[PDB]
Amino acid sequence: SVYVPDEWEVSREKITLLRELGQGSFGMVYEGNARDIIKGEAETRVAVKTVNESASLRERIEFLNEASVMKGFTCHHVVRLLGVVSKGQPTLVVMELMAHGDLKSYLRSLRPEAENNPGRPPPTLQEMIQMAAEIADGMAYLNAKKFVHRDLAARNCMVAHDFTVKIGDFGMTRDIYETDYYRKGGKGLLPVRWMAPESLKDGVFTTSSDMWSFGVVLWEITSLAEQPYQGLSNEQVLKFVMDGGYLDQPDNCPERVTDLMRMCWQFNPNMRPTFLEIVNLLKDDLHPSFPEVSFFHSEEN
Numbered sequence: 454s455v456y457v458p459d460e461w462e463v464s465r466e467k468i469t470l471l472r473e474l475g476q477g478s479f480g481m482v483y484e485g486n487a488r489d490i491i492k493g494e495a496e497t498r499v500a501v502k503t504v505n506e507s508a509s510l511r512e513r514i515e516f517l518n519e520a521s522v523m524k525g526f527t528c529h530h531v532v533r534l535l536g537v538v539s540k541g542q543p544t545l546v547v548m549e550l551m552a553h554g555d556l557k558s559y560l561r562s563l564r565p566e567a568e569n570n571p572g573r574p575p576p577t578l579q580e581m582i583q584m585a586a587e588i589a590d591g592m593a594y595l596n597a598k599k600f601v602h603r604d605l606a607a608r609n610c611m612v613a614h615d616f617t618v619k620i621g622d623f624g625m626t627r628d629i630y631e632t633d634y635y636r637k638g639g640k641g642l643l644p645v646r647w648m649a650p651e652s653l654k655d656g657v658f659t660t661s662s663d664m665w666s667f668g669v670v671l672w673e674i675t676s677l678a679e680q681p682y683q684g685l686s687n688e689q690v691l692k693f694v695m696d697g698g699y700l701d702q703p704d705n706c707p708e709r710v711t712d713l714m715r716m717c718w719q720f721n722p723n724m725r726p727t728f729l730e731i732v733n734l735l736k737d738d739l740h741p742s743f744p745e746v747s748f749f750h751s752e753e754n
């Protein structure tokens with residue numbers, strides 16, 4: 454419980470909170486305007502995440518330390534941390550704004566019956582491949598930095614103003630999608646419907662179990678984010694998957710996407726593909742901008 458201010462610290466005076474976006478599991482997230490936060494931009498539309506005002510000083514420290522995990526990361530397909538306001542109150546962290554929010558909420562809005570349907574039809578095959586490659590590229594970047602995500606899921610991806618999908622601001626959906634988590638004392642909140650068998654069995658998270666979860670994200674894309682194993686309880690899901698079960702393809706699932714899921718859900722984790730291998734499989738079928746922005750095509754890879 455210490456937070457030392459660094460080069461990410463920004464003056465509170467630069468940040469204006471404009472409207473609520475939604476409740477993060479630790480506090481309200483707002484849309485804001487930030488002055489002189491990005492070099493070359495006089496002003497930037499941002500998201501800014503806070504703690505609940507009921508939070509202790511130590512909880513604010515823990516919040517900032519958890520948020521700071523993202524400081525090292527620079528990838529087009531991972532949501533970017535822009536600044537921190539730790540001095541005074543309220544505690545703020547300023548993030549790249551993702552205009553269409555989290556991918557689970559977004560996908561659900563595309564259901565024909567949804568009250569908030571934006572008029573956009575469900576994703577085409579080309580759109581799904583594009584999303585898959587973007588998610589896999591962000592994940593490849595993170596895994597290359599020896600970072601294991603542990604909670605890859607549509608709710609933890611975000612959708613930008615230009616409809617690019619990115620790995621979302623980390624750990625932001627435990628309130629809006631609380632039912633996606635099974636609390637198991639000692640282990641904390643477990644996203645059991647997204648977890649690999651060895652993670653369920655042994656509490657082990659690896660890049661190979663991130664790949665398992667990627668398979669489930671593809672399933673959510675093709676099902677418009679139904680609950681995986683709907684109508685099994687959390688304890689039933691945990692046993693089902695440990696015993697070798699995995700998700701059946703949604704109705705009308707495109708074959709190419711089905712095949713990706715099947716690779717992700719191999720029982721032996723050493724047999725699953727890597728994220729770079731996923732991007733390699735998809736590379737010839739993407740927007741022209743992809744090689745300009747991807748980790749996969751970068752000298753860093």
Ligand SMILES: O=C1N=Nc2nnc(-c3c(-c4ccccc4)nn4ccccc34)cc21
Nearest residue numbers: 474475477482500548549550551552554622
């Ligand atoms: O934590 C974020 N970092 N960048 C973001 N961009 N957007 C949102 C966001 C969220 C949101 C996502 C997760 C938790 C809380 C709020 N909802 N939303 C609705 C419309 C437009 C944007 C958004 C959240 C973040």
